[PDB]
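Aim 2, interim progress: modelling of the zinc ion-bound target.
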Amino acid sequence: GHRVIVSDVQESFIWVRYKRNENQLIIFADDTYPRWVTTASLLDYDTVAGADKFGNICVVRLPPNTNDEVDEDRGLLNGASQKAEVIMNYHVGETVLSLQKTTLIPGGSESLVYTTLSGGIGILVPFTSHEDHDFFQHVEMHLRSEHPPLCGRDHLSFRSYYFPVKNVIDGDLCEQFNSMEPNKQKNVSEELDRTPPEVSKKLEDIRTRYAF
Amino acid sequence: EHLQSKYIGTGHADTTKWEWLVNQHRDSYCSYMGHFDLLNYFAIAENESKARVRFNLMEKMLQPCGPPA
Amino acid sequence: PYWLYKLHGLNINYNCEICGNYTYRGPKAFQRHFAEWRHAHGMRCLGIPNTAHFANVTQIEDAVSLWAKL
Amino acid sequence: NDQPSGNLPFLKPDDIQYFDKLLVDVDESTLSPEEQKERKIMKLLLKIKNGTPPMRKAALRQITDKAREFGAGPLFNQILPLLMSPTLEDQERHLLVKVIDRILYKLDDLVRPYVHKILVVIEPLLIDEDYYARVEGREIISNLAKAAGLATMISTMRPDIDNMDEYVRNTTARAFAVVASALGIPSLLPFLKAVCKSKKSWQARHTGIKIVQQIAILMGCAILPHLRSLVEIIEHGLVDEQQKVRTISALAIAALAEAATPYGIESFDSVLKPLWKGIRQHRGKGLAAFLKAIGYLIPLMDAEYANYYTREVMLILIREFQSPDEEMKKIVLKVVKQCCGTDGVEANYIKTEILPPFFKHFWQHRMALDRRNYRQLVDTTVELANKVGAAEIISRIVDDLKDEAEQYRKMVMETIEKIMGNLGAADIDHKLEEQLIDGILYAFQEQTTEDSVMLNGFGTVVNALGKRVKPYLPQICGTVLWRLNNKSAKVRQQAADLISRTAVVMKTCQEEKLMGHLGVVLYEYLGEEYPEVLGSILGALKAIVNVIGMHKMTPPIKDLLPRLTPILKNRHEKVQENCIDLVGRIADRGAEYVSAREWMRICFELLELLKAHKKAIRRATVNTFGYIAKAIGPHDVLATLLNNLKVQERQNRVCTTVAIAIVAETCSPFTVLPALMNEYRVPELNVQNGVLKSLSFLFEYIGEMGKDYIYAVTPLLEDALMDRDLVHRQTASAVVQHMSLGVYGFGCEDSLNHLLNYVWPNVFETSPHVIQAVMGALEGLRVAIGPCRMLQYCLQGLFHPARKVRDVYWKIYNSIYIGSQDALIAHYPRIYNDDKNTYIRYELDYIL
Amino acid sequence: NRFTVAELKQLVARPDVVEMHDVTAQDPKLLVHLKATRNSVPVPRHWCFKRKYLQGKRGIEKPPFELPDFIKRTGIQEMREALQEKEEQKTMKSKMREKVRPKMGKIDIDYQKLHDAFFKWQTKPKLTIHGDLYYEGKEFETRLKKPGDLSDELRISLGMPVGPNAHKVPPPWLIAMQRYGPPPSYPNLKIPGLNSPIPESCSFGYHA
Amino acid sequence: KDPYFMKNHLGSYECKLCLTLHNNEGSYLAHTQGKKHQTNLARRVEVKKFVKIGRPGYKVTKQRDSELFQIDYPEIAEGIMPRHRFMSAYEQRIEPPDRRWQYLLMAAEPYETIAFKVPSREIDKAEGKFWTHWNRETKQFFLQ
Amino acid sequence: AKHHPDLIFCRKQAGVAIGRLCEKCDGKCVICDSYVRPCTLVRICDECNYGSYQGRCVICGGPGVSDAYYCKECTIQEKDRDGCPKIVNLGSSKTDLFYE
Ligand SMILES: [Zn+2]
Ligand SMILES: [Zn+2]
Ligand SMILES: [Zn+2]
Ligand SMILES: [Zn+2]
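Predicted structure of the complex, ligand included:
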């Protein structure tokens, strides 16, 4: 409403203002990265979550000022002037072709559902408080160490395949805490200063709260 | 010198547009057929099967941009 | 000083046709002179607006063609 | 005038031929063609051969930077007759070959006529005595190889094959082997096939087979893929009429078989029948070469043929234990080692008839003198102990631990220490451990050298006996303490070292009374005037501090460390090293033992335990700074290290920036970080580069905890990267590198993109340290902010008009490309099609 | 062979960026296309200079360093400055005497204040976007204002008090604008007491 | 009293007119002598050095004229006549308050300079050729 | 090393022989020469580990004691996935010091 989010096939999201008094279509923001966006979805009045051909998922939130009132020659770097900024990049591994903000279970809360091209279906759920975010960050930062992937591919350097990862905790590595031998679970859990049933309770609470 | 003999695609101070773009196209083709899902995406856009797309890509890596200049 | 004007491109003649075939004893001073009151008025007699598109054109017949392109 | 007219150095009176034209001045006109150049390149050589090291490095840089201008002609006809003087030195010869290789990267493809003139000087470096002269010889013949190509080498070194002199022929063979290494075997393998089958004079065949032998002994397992086509060259030998050709063909077969282990045995099948006929049919030195060849072949063989060839070569080996000549003694001493390392030779056969004439004829005195007959004999005796047993060999040589030759006791102790290191001490009964305990005590007591072989033998033996050494600790320790009182000074050093070897065996033998006996004894032997005595005292006392607790030892640390703080002012490297090892262990594990002002008054002492030329001293003292800080707090030791930053000496400022990073991470870093950020306001150069170097080390040390402190120090590096003095920029670029790899994957990609804007204009610097610091920072930011961002920066400078910007931007693009080649696929720009070629990647462009 | 700046400006879809040297390249169309590609950054300014990128900062004197505010609120600057000015009076007699008899606890500030200032009061600095490279003059080009507002600095120099009363506060060109019209070049400028209400549109003026 | 010596932000020294950097204390004061500093000093003596100066106050004889000072001067033995100059009170050795008048200053080499206060703005002309006379033989000096 | 710029690495294909470091070199990263955060073992090629060359220091050529390692900043930059990091030549240092 009153804004347009034009997805280029190569560069990125280009914000466009439409005016009522005139009929102009004024570009007033674009993004610094190239993306090859496939589809996209609006989350707030500012932010646009998008997905690309190569596998990633980005979220581009406008800066807090970014005034739309631009009436009409130099650009900033051969483009627009208010460059938007990115507040997550994450690698999924498949070309994500559908993003949607919804609530999959009544009694739950909103969660960005993505449906990939190789059949998979995932969600990206926000964190409520910093204690949850810091706990899950330390859980997956332990699981990159104790439980490396099978092919030898480094997990941080898989999720940071094209662009480096930002503000996303991989819950598929976290939900392999329930799949180790119990000596490893006891080691990680005493490193977390909890007990492994409490860690598995905390680890499935996010899934049952947000989704299936 | 020794890089461009060993690690192909690097390039030097006198690398023309054609050599840089032919290394660009060859690395693009090997990453298309390397990733499964870019190959999925290029198979949906035609009705070709995956082996038809891989043969079409693999036969193009010899001279992808055209004859040299 | 001899080396100070041999390093700096000075007293090595370059000519800007649009300001009445004015002369310039330095390349740095030349590309500086393009954004000046004299050269801007010399394009203002042509009616060509002062932008950065017309940066290093000297001959009028190229400048009027370039402004015809826009 | 008898010395030339300036501050040119002193001419020795036999250097007045090569620098003869320096005593007369030219006043450069009326005699100045290129002659005024060559006299100049005369002068530089005198500044290199005879000068002070500033004159050396000045003339050496001035002769490398103008080697294009001087040309190989004058330069080599001056350098080469200087090396052909009969009155050189070792260091003058070394500086001359340094001068020759330092112009071989500049005169690429211009030393084409001067290859043979280089080789007739450089070829005797390969047969030289000292190892590093051999390495310089091999290195510059490999450089001459890669610089002169291949066909020039073949045209030069072919007349040196049928040459009359044997020394030029042998050195030509070794030169051919090193050019074969630097240019690959199959480049010149047709030439070896040519020269080895050439039949006009046998010396050409002998030379080519020598070439094959030195190729095999030079490059070990890189002869393996070309092995079959190379042994086919040699196998046309062994049937030549000359004994020298057959002998060197057998030696070449031995070198190839030692090189290809264990492989290629199918490629050796056409060699075994002339080898068998040769060892059966005749005696001589051809027997010795054939015997070395079969002794290297049969470990490459399958067990049936290995057993058959071993059991009918032992007859000749027993026949040649009586042999007088020394090279066949060395050869059968080698052949026994491989002929019993396999299955097939049963242990009773060996203990009945292999080893008794072995010990009769090989454990002599003269075999211990020659080093290549020392080490071969002891390594063969160890293998005979591997097969037969430990006790059967040890009981046969244990009575000679009490001999009167020091080299023979050294040989026997080295044999026994290698056996009991390999096998163990379970075999030795109680009737023989007293024999060897008295043997090693007498052998330790009566050595005249400073060798550590008796010490390591004692340590390995009493480690192997374990708990069975208990009724010898009264015998040993009473031997030790009376050893510690001597008019001699080194034998006290022999005693205390022994304690540091036998401290580990008394706790595992329930002997802590006697450790409590000799800790308090060693407490008063550390007022010793001699430094190397007191260093071994401190080593023994360190071993006792380890093997007991720190808090349950009898000269207790309440009054052991106060005695150690004046030891720490001793400038000897041994005493410093052992004293700060002990002070570091006391400082982290026992810091509740002294005054916490004593720690202050020794952390002023560890500022001069830097400037210590040993680099283990300097890296133990910074750990000691960290431990002292963890004891008494990171606010007094930090002010000490920040006062130390204005001292004018590196090796005293970089090793305190290390210490500031150590106290930063051993406490939490905020405890140091405002004070360390405040010292950037001190308007001196060394303290500002000190806080930048210490931030580099701090971020490298803390790693993933840099997410908290990056916003604090980004306004510091943004000020350092704007500063004129380029050491600020190289150290701030190092900080950007370590910080960028420390916050990877944490979402701090905005601060690094800020700092990249200031790092990136330092791309065009040409000082090598700052260019490698900025380029390490760029390839360390590539992973932090992405290859996309670094490709956006590296773009549009790739095709800039100037070569000076084009090559720097292309090498940063090469670093990005080989860093992450896959990730660049999404980030490439769109490049439209011209007339003849198509450039749009159309596959990415279409959409479902 | 090297066609001049004229024809190169004719050929390129964006002749804004093609400069004096790009005709002397080895591929001008590609170079000016990459110069006009979207989010790239340009080559540093000192590739053609003669002064080694910062050896023109010779004679200018600069402040030492401004510590960030959260670190300055730990008192470390005041204690450390007092300690340096105390140590600058010591002779070598007392400098080597307090090397063996040290009085410690000279600063000994606390750890809760430092852990607060690095974790509670941490401040985001003023960063910059990825295009904004650095050149030598950069921090002294700081000059990089609107119709209808006047700064406090300009109002002191003009003697024009900021107040809301659109007629006594106005700029002294008010009477002339009532006579001659509003700005020819600001058609939508609204001035309080002219074409905007006097007490309502008190921002001096506004484009609306 | 050097006005071009600067110490920069990192404890080195700089000549400000030459714009040159110097590492240590002794490398600036060996640059103040040298072809870079002297020629830049010229771009930005002997008779002054050898002035004999006893500093002896001569005897003046001021007198109100109408249509003049009479200085008795002992022997100079040189060709150069005594010289006058009008000087302002703005620059002085003590610089104290009340500066704001002019002095007619008289000098000749071996002996002391003499000053005469003028509070009126204009009454005469303190010029050399127009209005001075030198009775060198009797050694009385004139100026009106 | 990075201090001596004339030293070259082997850079051939890394085999299974684990590289070793001497007593004078203990703790060093092979590429960086930094002492902190070792993460990845060193695998030297087969020509650089043959016969008398076994168990020998990667940097020195002296007798090895401990296992060699890449640091974490070599691991995450993937400097462990180029070749055999065995420093081949001894050049212009520890040779004139032998000659002095
Ligand atoms: Zn000066
Ligand atoms: Zn490393
Ligand atoms: Zn190797
Ligand atoms: Zn080493």
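Chain F has four helices and nine strands. The helical segments of chain F are 25-28, 35-43, 46-49, 128-131.
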